[PDB]
Design an enzyme around this catalytic site. Sequence first.
Site: not given
Length: 122
Positions: A39-43, A10, A12, A117-119, A83, A64
Site C-alpha cells: 500500500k503506497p500511503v497509509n496514516t 485495522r 488506521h 475511510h481516512f481521507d 510512505r 476528495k
Amino acid sequence: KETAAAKFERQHMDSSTASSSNYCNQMMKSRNLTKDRCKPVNTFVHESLADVQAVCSQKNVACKNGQTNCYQSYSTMSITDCRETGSSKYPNCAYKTTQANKHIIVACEGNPYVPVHFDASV
C-alpha cells in the site's frame, strides 16, 4: 467478512502509543497492509478510538472524491504517515515514517455513524 468500520480501525488506529524510524515497516506488515501489494500511503492515528469516532460529529467537509460525508477534527491529532520508499519492492515493502500533529479528515457512514475511510490530514 470485515466491516468497513473494523477495516478503518485495522488500517488506521494505533491508540497504543513515540514512533521509531522502523515503525511503519513493522506496522504496515502487522496490520496486513502489505499482503497483496505494498500500500503506497497509509496514516495511523494515535488518539483514542472515542476521540476519532467523535470526528464524525465535528466539521463537515467535502471528501476528495466529491462526496459530502467527510469530517475534519476540531483539534489537531497525533498521527504517523507511512510512505513507501523508492527502494521498496514487494513483498519486502519499505516505508518512511513521519510523525506529525495535524487535523484529520475521515469519511463517516452507517448506523452508528463511524469512520470508514481516512481521507486526508491538514
